[PDB]
Amino acid sequence: PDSLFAGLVGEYYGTNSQLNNISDFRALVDSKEADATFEAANISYGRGSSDVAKGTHLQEFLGSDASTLSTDPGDNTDGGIYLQGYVYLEAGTYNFKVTADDGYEITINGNPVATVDNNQSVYTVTHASFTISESGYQAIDMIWWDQGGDYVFQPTLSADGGSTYFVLDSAILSSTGETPYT
Ligand SMILES: O[C@@H]1CO[C@@H](O)C[C@@H]1O
Ligand SMILES: [Ca+2]
Ligand SMILES: [Ca+2]
Ligand SMILES: [Ca+2]
Ligand SMILES: [Ca+2]
Ligand SMILES: [Ca+2]
């Protein structure tokens, strides 16, 4: 049985190898069990300095979500997160606008909808629009990593053509696709 909560299933992975791109982080995820798990209920993380993977920086980065960490990871030079679950969206057009250091990829119903395939100091990208064909819980996953230094990850979403954006949080997230009452 998988726990039902108003959030995405979160996994954190650390490494002492360099993360340069999405492929490197996905390979890290493939290579071992998560260094920690957590509930991603308020996906607006950071900003901080001096490496996400060292000391208590992950806790600080995750903020309101850190109280759900399964363990306190040891130090690494590089690290990142893999989030997966469901997000309630009505049929219509949407676009992400993401602030991040380093890179990331977000997919909805298996299709990439926001990609930065490289390292970067903090930068905000307004991504191209996509459509949702049927109202309901949509499958969503995210990866984000830090190669070192500063770190931030805030992927906001607009349903109104970029006039207003919201953080993905417990209002609309579901870990399993069932309706959370938590
Ligand atoms: O990863 C970013 C780009 O490289 C360095 O400037 C650190 C910074 O956080
Ligand atoms: Ca794994
Ligand atoms: Ca630690
Ligand atoms: Ca909390
Ligand atoms: Ca590094
Ligand atoms: Ca960084």
Author numbering: 10 to 191
What do the paper's sentences say?
MpPA14 (Marinomonas primoryensis PA14 domain) lectin is a domain of a 1.5-MDa adhesin responsible for a symbiotic bacterium-diatom interaction in Antarctica. Bioinformatic analyses indicated the presence of an ∼20-kDa domain near the C terminus of MpIBP that is a member of the PA14 family, which is a carbohydrate-binding lectin module widely distributed across several kingdoms of life. The DcisD motif coordinates a Ca2+ ion that is directly involved in binding polar vicinal hydroxyl groups of various carbohydrates.
We further analyzed the crystal structures of MpPA14 in complex with three pentoses, l-arabinose, ribose, and 2-deoxy-ribose, as well as inositol, which has an unusual 6-carbon saccharide ring without an endocyclic oxygen. These four carbohydrates bound MpPA14 more weakly than glucose and mannose. As pentoses have a higher percentage of furanose present in the conformational equilibria than do hexoses, selectivity for the more thermodynamically stable pyranoses might contribute to the weaker affinity of pentoses toward the lectin. For instance, despite l-arabinose existing in solution predominantly in the pyranose form at 25°C (57% α-arabinopyranose versus 30.5% β-arabinopyranose), only the α-anomer complexes MpPA14 via its 1,2-diol.
